[PDB]
Amino acid sequence: RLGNRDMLITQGTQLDCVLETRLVTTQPGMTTCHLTRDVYSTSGRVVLLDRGSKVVGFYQGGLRQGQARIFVQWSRIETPSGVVINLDSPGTGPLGEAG
Amino acid sequence: LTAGGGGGGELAEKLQPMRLSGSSAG
């Protein structure tokens, strides 16, 4: 069973953020996006990540022949009120396809 | 006569700092 649904974000919650930096895979680098909407607890009663929070992540390895998507992971998020948590998740496209 | 975590093995390696020791004049 879950501990407290009012302060808990389960796996598979969908965070919608807008990419800040233009992405070029020629070198292993670092990314940045800002959340665009408030993100609630799975109970849907508390705003846990204030909209506009900053998200930092990275990638590596470049592509391989024929591959059409690069795989980025997001390291650390920041709520403008000072909250920092280490979420480690795979970056996706607008509809959530890998990479 | 005598007396006697470390993941991102590519990136997190390319960000390896390179410090150089300072010098002092003489």
Binding site: - | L20, S21, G22, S23, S24, A25, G26
Partner: protein, 47 residues
């Protein structure tokens, strides 16, 4: 062939670089340089 033998042997020659004297060159100090032990400032008395 003979051409192939000659070329395969004498193709890898490092290019030689010539630099004129009196050109401007610049140094990018890579390490902090201290002088506290060799220099000192004293005020010049007025008049």
């Amino acid at each position: 062939s003979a051409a192939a033998e000659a070329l395969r042997n004498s193709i890898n020659i490092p290019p030689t670089l010539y630099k004129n004297q009196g050109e401007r060159v610049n140094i990018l100090v890579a390490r902090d340089l201290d002088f506290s032990d060799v220099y000192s400032l004293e005020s010049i008395p007025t008049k």
